Design a protein around this ligand. Structure first.
Ligand SMILES: COc1ccc(CCN2CCC(Nc3nc4ccccc4n3Cc3ccc(F)cc3)CC2)cc1
Lengths: 210, 210, 199, 166
């Protein structure tokens, strides 16, 4: 049970990594998804004299809405699995025992935020493309693949690199917003980066000396 | 008349957002401005028999010059409404009781400074228009709307995005200064952003800890 | 005597501003220079020693290049730091002034580097001339100084606007040195400012 | 023994600067095995306690390791760029087009200066825009470089802010 919580933390990290990715890029394997949802089902099973009434006190329903399947496009409906992060949020006291764990959690949450912003950025640059201004056209013109166009690997890597540059104050200049929606997204990313960057790096600066 | 203070704070935020924008861009709705003017007249009437003499020789001058009308440049003279910020300045004691209020005030003042700098940036670009050196010409050439020219939405979003990028010190490389006035303004904005960061956005973890 | 010390600080700021600029740009008003020199002579006379005499030698009969020895007047400000380090915004104002002075000196060095290779499309001066529509005599002294100061400020603040970027080995090494100096100075200045701001 | 430790530290800094430089730039297999000298820094790592007497010494050590990390990342970046140059994609071709000599191409001095300048710009979060990644390998390397550079920013200038108040 002691390692069960850490395993569940790894599983929620995995699903937070791979649910927006599948809902943004690969939407047009499932074995790992099936295994992970089975593990989450067995976890809610073990988590339940009769402490069941204590469990059904506003904490079981939020897991239930994040446990049921949606089988009956539909990536938006399986995007609801992201509610599982409340499980790792409810027991932060156990995970924050050691400073190294805190540093690992800070790095993981920064990477997760960058990944989520990358997925949102790709969605923004993809839904507008059918209507040479979008960043996908610039990406295709830069590499030797005019828009077929670049493969999904190149698009994801470029989106992640641009988001990391935006949050890290670099501003590389290869990828640069052109459309109004891209500029608004960049403004929101700048505000979010101010918040996170400041808090995370102040926290690590405090932590390192301890 | 206790929650009225936060309503007047919201109206102050509204006027500080919409007066510089109107002056900078719309010089070439009025109902909302008339409503907030009537509301501020009601407020200054409420501010009033032994207590009238107290502030009669105090804050009356500013709160009266900020509420007098000029309808009879009128648009340029309408900028006198910015004196309503002294209300928030003087009544800061009631707006600094909770950490959430402090964070909201910090975000609001950051956004307000960015908006004001965007308005000044567009003002400079407009005064330099009749003399592809300027940034408006480059923006029009790059969003596919050669100089007609970009719409007001495009110009405002571009100005706000440039100001946010430069204050945050990202420097995206889409819009860049190309005139002496623009370069001096950029130097000033860099100084303002660096001071803003090193003054407030440092130790934001400790700020939140309050 | 406090008014005298503040005026001396202002004149030191003036000479630190105007000596490197003159040496870098104006070399290939004198009345104000002579007035300030006479005022510094009367200041050392009323002070009643070696470090003051060497920096105040009248250079008569390259003189303009050799005039940089007048930049030895900031040490005099350093001695009387007790009155400058005092409660209020004076410390923050002085820190901003020295940051701007470092930016100005680096801008002068950047223009000196750019001009030494101008006679030899490659280089920031040619790019600057092309951008503002004055192909290479190209840009005026005002344009060159503003561009150099803007690039130096962007490099020190790490904005990196991308309008002006190093494109030669000399400029690249200079930008590396400015990056190191800016890291150290940014850390120091905006750590002490961020610690002072608690008052 | 006081002067001996400083001399050994200088020699360790010298070999740590030189060996990856040779391996990455002056290849033309023995150098790959010779790069095992990088583990020799464990001596300075264990004697850092002896090197932590005064704030000036630790500040200079911080600047030295900043420069060393920048140098190693520059060597790795040059190796990445050179592994794809034979097969306008990349940064070597763009650099050759910029400075004037098309791909002969730039000399070793120009290539190293460009690599170090880009590494410093990415580490210090400037992003000059003169040279930018254009391949997936380069993009991933840049992504790693931003994080390590910002971590070193936080650490070494938090230290610097600590000593300056002392
Ligand atoms: C050349 O040598 C050097 C060495 C070091 C430095 C300081 C660089 N470092 C200092 C912090 C700077 N960021 C930054 N400005 C901000 C302005 C307002 C609010 C927040 C700000 N934030 C944090 C931030 C960062 C990224 C982001 F997306 C959003 C916010 C920029 C990062 C400069 C020159």
């Amino acid at each position: 049970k002691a390692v069960w919580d850490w395993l569940i933390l790894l599983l929620v990290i995995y699903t937070a990594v791979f649910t927006p990715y599948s809902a943004a890029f690969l939407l047009k394997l499932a074995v790992v998804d099936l295994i992970v949802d089975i593990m989450f089902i067995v976890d809610i099973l073990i988590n339940f004299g009769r402490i069941a009434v204590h469990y059904f006190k506003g904490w079981f329903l939020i897991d239930m809405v994040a446990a049921i399947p949606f089988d009956l496009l539909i990536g938006l409906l399986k995007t609801a699995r992201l509610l599982r992060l409340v499980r790792v949020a409810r027991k932060l006291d156990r995970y924050s025992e050691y400073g190294a764990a805190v540093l690992f959690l800070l790095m993981c949450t920064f990477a997760l935020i960058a990944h989520w912003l990358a997925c949102i950025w790709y969605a923004i640059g993809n839904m507008e493309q059918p209507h040479r201004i979008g960043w996908l056209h610039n990406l295709g013109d830069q590499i030797g693949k005019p828009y077929g166009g670049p493969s999904i690997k190149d698009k994801y890597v470029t989106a992640l690199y641009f988001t990391f540059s935006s949050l890290t104050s670099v501003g590389f200049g290869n990828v640069s917003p052109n459309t109004n929606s891209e500029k608004i997204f960049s403004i929101c990313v700048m505000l979010i980066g101010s918040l996170m960057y400041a808090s995370i790096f102040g926290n690590v600066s405090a932590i390192i000396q301890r």
